[PDB]
């Protein structure tokens, strides 16, 4: 019982 | 570049096989009914055009 649910974008380093 | 590989002895002659990993590529153009024209490139370890 656990809840893995995430997604990502283009090859940037981190935040802007 | 130098590389030294240390390797177990074998009673028979053997080869080290290397791949220098590279971008080996082509681009292909077809501008009239009769014809095709290809540009090749290989970025490290080039061989011309």
């Amino acid at each position: 019982m656990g809840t893995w649910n995430e997604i990502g974008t283009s090859q940037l380093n981190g935040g802007a | 570049l130098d590389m030294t590989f240390e390797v177990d002895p074998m009673d028979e002659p053997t080869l080290l096989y290397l791949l220098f990993e590279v971008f080996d590529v082509v681009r292909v153009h077809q501008p009239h009914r009769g014809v095709i024209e290809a540009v090749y490139l290989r970025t490290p370890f080039s061989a011309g055009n």
């Binding site: - | 009239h32 009914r33 009769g34 014809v35």
Partner: protein, 99 residues
Amino acid sequence: DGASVRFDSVNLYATFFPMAHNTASTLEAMLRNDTNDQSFNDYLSAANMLYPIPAKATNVPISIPSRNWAAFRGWSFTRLKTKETPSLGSGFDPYFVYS
């Protein structure tokens, strides 16, 4: 018929004019400017197209589909035997049996 060849060493030779350093430096400075680029053209400036002619044939029709002919200089031509000429681009021609 047994012929063979073996290269034991290839060395590169180069000869220099022992030019005065201030003059050679000045010449380089000028030859590195983009308006002073060197330029050359192949003496036989031509596209070397070869077309086959079967044995006993007497007519050789050829065509080019559509082309830009700007700066075209004209046609030059001659006939060769197939035996007497190698194919090239192939690093070796296993069918070039003449010498």
